[PDB]
Amino acid sequence: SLTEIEHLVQSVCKSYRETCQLRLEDLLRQRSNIFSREEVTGYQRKSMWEMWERCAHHLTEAIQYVVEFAKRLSGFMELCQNDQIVLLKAGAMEVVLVRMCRAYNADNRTVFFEGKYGGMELFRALGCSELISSIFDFSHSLSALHFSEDEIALYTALVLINAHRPGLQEKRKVEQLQYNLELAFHHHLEKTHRQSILAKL
Amino acid sequence: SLTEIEHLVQSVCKSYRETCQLRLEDLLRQRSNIFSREEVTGYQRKSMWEMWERCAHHLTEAIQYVVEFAKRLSGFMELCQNDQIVLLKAGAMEVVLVRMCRAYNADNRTVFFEGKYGGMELFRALGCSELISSIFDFSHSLSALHFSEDEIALYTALVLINAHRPGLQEKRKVEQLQYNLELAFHHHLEKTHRQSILAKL
Numbered sequence A, B: 001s002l003t004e005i006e007h008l009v010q011s012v013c014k015s016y017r018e019t020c021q022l023r024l025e026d027l028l029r030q031r032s033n034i035f036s037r038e039e040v041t042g043y044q045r046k047s048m049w050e051m052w053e054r055c056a057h058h059l060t061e062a063i064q065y066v067v068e069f070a071k072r073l074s075g076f077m078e079l080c081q082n083d084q085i086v087l088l089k090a091g092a093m094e095v096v097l098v099r100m101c102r103a104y105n106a107d108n109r110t111v112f113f114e115g116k117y118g119g120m121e122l123f124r125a126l127g128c129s130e131l132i133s134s135i136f137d138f139s140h141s142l143s144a145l146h147f148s149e150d151e152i153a154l155y156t157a158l159v160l161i162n163a164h165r166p167g168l169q170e171k172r173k174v175e176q177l178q179y180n181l182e183l184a185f186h187h188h189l190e191k192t193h194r195q196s197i198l199a200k201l
């Protein structure tokens, strides 16, 4: 449990990288590529039905990739079908949300969506202004932690692999996986000098 | 195709009745059982996260029952796995919405939700006031058609079994199912003297 834990970090990070939808360098570069008023207006003039379809498609894709990420964690495939589903039900949306913070630009308060960056107003046709502001505020406050890629990988791993979830058959097995991931997270934070973030999550 | 079509109506209606979540008589009776201010306030004070969980659970249940209804239609099981999924993806939410009109009371503008009736304000914590009003307006306008149970059964059947859906392997097979359901719908409307509704949907 020294080279074993160092392989778990390498593994979690690789599983994350190969199941992240977008490469970070493209997300950062594309910050300058902002939707015009004309384009934003095009999205706002879409019917409530059309927009919900579009946005539901993207969410579904995002969740699929989170499933692929979960399957890639050591031990996740060894859980009974009930537990796999429970952990994904309790964890997926939180992982999508943390993953989305990468696509959020706190400087101008925009997100990457369908190839360009735009603000909350993009989603006006959905009729969820309050919900969308709360999603943006979450991203905003999470972006102030300046999470590295490797940190997202390890942290989203711990979000999914949570033994406290209601409905779980094998609490003890999940506890072991969780514990190994906790060791992995805290180890990588020690070597990178980033222990300070533990207090503020 | 006279006793055959009369058996299809009986069949569709029975499949609907055994996959409707709530009996209509209970829905109508429970119209008088309205949430108090105290109870409505309890829902509004729930966090955005808590309410979304609750409402997502109910939606998921509603969709499950719509799946059971689809499987119960003659020919639906005979479609390849791709087509089954396509038709459910394109149709489910529309069926949920039509089914929900039964739980909507146009007289006081309330819906049945978790055991009592309440208005739009129940869902304030979700942050989707615009979306929720559009759902209520849909129910409102649909409730003015005064759809019988048998009519919902046959109409929701035609919503799902639509050959025009993008992504379909066996367009010709779905066309045959659709056509039989169209015959069944129009037949039942003839015998019940309710041809007038065809113009206004």
Ligand SMILES: O=S(=O)(Nc1ccc2c(c1)N(S(=O)(=O)Cc1ccc(C(F)(F)F)cc1)CCC2)c1ccc(F)cc1F
Binding pocket: A054, A055, A056, A058, A059, A062, A093, A096, A097, A098, A099, A100, A101, A103, A111, A112, A113, A114, A123, A132, A135
């Ligand atoms: O390409 S996206 O679909 N763009 C995007 C970026 C931000 C948002 C939305 C969509 N949407 S959406 O409805 O089309 C899909 C969506 C994404 C995330 C969430 C979240 F609440 F779980 F975070 C909900 C819906 C509205 C909420 C904010 C995307 C999805 C996941 C991700 F990690 C990054 C993304 F850019």
Ligand SMILES: O=S(=O)(Nc1ccc2c(c1)N(S(=O)(=O)Cc1ccc(C(F)(F)F)cc1)CCC2)c1ccc(F)cc1F
Binding pocket: B054, B055, B056, B058, B059, B062, B093, B096, B097, B098, B099, B100, B101, B103, B111, B112, B113, B114, B123, B132, B135
């Ligand atoms: O017991 S319900 O869950 N109560 C109910 C009645 C009306 C609504 C909601 C919930 N919700 S919800 O978010 O908790 C579940 C939901 C139900 C229907 C739809 C619809 F848009 F597809 F119609 C969306 C969400 C908000 C929209 C209006 C229910 C679900 C389906 C149904 F056909 C009848 C119901 F009463």
